[PDB]
Design a protein around this ligand. Structure first.
Ligand SMILES: CN1C[C@H](Nc2nc3cc[nH]c3c(=O)n2C)C[C@H](c2ccc(OCc3ccccc3)cc2)C1
Ligand SMILES: CN1C[C@H](Nc2nc3cc[nH]c3c(=O)n2C)C[C@H](c2ccc(OCc3ccccc3)cc2)C1
Lengths: 215, 215
């Protein structure tokens, strides 16, 4: 019965992670010391309840930009064009001139986007190695390499109109570069017209795959 | 050790459910008896492998319409911005005049959409009570009630431009009916301009939340 743990305190507003892997607002209604660490009981605003580890709760405020760094464990807004969801990720880039003063987020499922400071929430008790709670092993391993090598970031230069092969579902596909935005490129898959924003250091882009397998 | 279980045959193309709850093409590489039933080993096209229950694999073909019914357990195409994913659900409506010859799908996460016959795949070994493998209990219970009562479906009649309260994250929001499509309405949330398709029998729509209470 930990009524408090640092600035965590029962009755506070909080975000908690659900089994959809999206994050939702609620109230912290209990803290319990249990075996090695602590667990946080959240009552979500839709009345659901969950007992969560400290890396599965986030503060209901936007961190000051000067408290974030490459590797920071965050919850960020994800937008499909009509709906908005909150999903966990890693800060891959902080605001700078070339990225038009945005944060690049690497989400736990492998997606990447640029967001603003007002679209982020800090996870309360992230693991010492921030990537170690990423479920997708290929994503986890990529983040570990990326944060460890930062700022050494191999990327490929692409231009609008350029024709390249892009990976999807374990095979290569004919694709076209539609647009470049900072460290991201918008790829059109020519066969079925899906579009995707992809990190320019991703080995899903054949030139990066190659530039990295160049022997 | 089996090479065949009915028309599940080692080497066949298949869809398998991953931990993202999306479904992905692969090959059936093994059939194993483990404990009381069978498991199906799938090698995904990206070379990952999973040992899956029969309700977590689907055939890689579109079922004949008129072999689908209300309650059928299916995998359906979902549009996520400019991306397309496969996700499990239940058939809520079969093609008719009112729905412009489409299938209404109630997805396992509570979303609903109309799809065509070429956007569906049949799950290989669904449970006889097909909803019983839905993880979200509120969703599971809704589907059980819906299928049991079908065709008797309380729904509210809405028209484009109508202003109503719609529930989201446990509170009620000023919203507007933008469009009616069969048993779905497209709701604009006026505060933040999110848009969402919602079933006209959902108690997230204030008028339905009251029609139900009135009964
Ligand atoms: C960050 N990811 C992004 C993902 N998109 C995406 N990922 C990748 C990866 C490589 N490429 C791409 C790509 O192109 N995209 C477009 C959608 C994903 C998501 C997950 C659950 C959910 O659940 C919604 C929900 C439903 C019911 C109740 C609560 C929540 C909604 C969205 C979040
Ligand atoms: C069917 N549901 C629909 C859901 N949308 C949605 N649901 C609800 C529920 C009430 N309302 C709404 C609403 O408005 N929406 C818009 C997105 C959800 C999804 C899940 C995972 C995923 O993962 C993508 C992925 C990423 C990396 C690797 C593999 C896969 C992509 C999409 C699927």
């Amino acid at each position: 019965e930990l009524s408090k743990d640092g600035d965590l305190i029962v009755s506070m507003r909080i975000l908690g992670k659900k089994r959809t892997k999206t994050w939702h607002k609620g109230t912290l209604i209990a803290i319990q010391t249990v075996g090695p660490g602590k667990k946080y009981k959240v009552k979500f605003d839709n009345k659901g309840k969950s007992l969560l580890s400290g890396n599965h709760i986030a503060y209901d405020y936007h961190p000051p930009a000067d408290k974030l760094y490459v590797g920071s464990r965050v919850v960020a807004k994800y937008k499909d064009g009509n709906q908005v969801w909150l999903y966990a990720g890693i800060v891959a880039e902080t605001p700078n001139v070339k990225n038009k003063l945005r944060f690049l987020i690497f989400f736990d499922d492998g997606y990447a986007s640029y967001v603003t400071q007002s679209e982020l929430y800090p996870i309360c008790r992230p693991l010492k190695k921030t990537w170690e709670d990423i479920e997708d092993i290929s994503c986890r391993d990529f983040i570990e390499e990326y944060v460890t090598a930062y700022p050494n970031r191999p990327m490929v230069l692409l231009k609008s109109g350029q024709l390249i092969k892009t990976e999807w579902e374990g095979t290569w596909w004919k694709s076209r570069v539609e647009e470049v935005d900072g460290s991201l490129v918008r790829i059109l898959f020519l066969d079925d017209k899906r579009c995707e924003w992809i990190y320019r250091g991703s080995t899903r882009l054949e030139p990066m795959f190659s530039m990295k397998t160049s022997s």
